[PDB]
RNA sequence: CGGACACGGACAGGAUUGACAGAUUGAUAGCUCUUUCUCGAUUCCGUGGGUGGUGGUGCAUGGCCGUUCUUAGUUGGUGGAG
């Protein structure tokens, strides 16, 4: 009930992800992937079959959530606003965390990791 | 592009930087072209708006300077004359 919720949104506010329409495929060909996560809204089946057939068979996890465009308002440009359009974005697809940086709720995410996934 | 900003568009399922080889050039200017890797919201597109200019106008001006002007010249106050 703390796994879907806000221990992800505390793994946003400036680490390390993908951005735009030319790197959210790219992070899965570097060695510093930590959790990352994908859409089950993709159009195509073969993009995600393209990011399974590194991860699934290496050290990296996806987490499957409901959309890319609910990505938007977690990756970082921020479209919700007082005097601005709430409907600025066509969010991520694949984003990574490069590093985590501090240690304040990080644990939760890492403890559904390991708990069925082993 | 060294066209700031403001709005809309473009916009993670493909906005934009940079670039080896070669006809391509005056030029090892990725200038353009053929082919293809790379860059991480940086931009690009449109519309308003800045911005820059050894661009005009010295008869639109400021400031400085030259000149009549190297000669002795100039002016109020108060009385007087009109
Ligand atoms: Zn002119």
Redesign the pocket.
């Known amino acids: 009930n703390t796994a879907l919720q806000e221990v992800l949104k505390t793994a946003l506010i400036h680490d390390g992800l ?9 992070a899965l060909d570097k060695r510093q992937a930590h959790l990352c996560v994908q ?1 089950s ?4 089946p073969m ?1 995600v079959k393209l990011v399974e057939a590194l991860l699934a068979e290496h050290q990296i996890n996806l987490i499957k959530v409901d ?2 465009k609910k990505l ?1 308002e977690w ?3 921020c479209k919700i606003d007082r005097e ?2 709430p409907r ?8 990574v965390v490069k590093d985590y940086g501090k240690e304040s709720q990080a644990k939760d995410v890492i403890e559904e990791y390991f708990k069925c996934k082993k």
Do not use: F, M
């Open positions: 993908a951005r735009g329409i030319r790197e959210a495929a790219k859409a809204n993709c159009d195509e993009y959309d890319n938007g990756v970082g440009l601005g359009n600025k974005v066509v969010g991520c697809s694949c984003v």
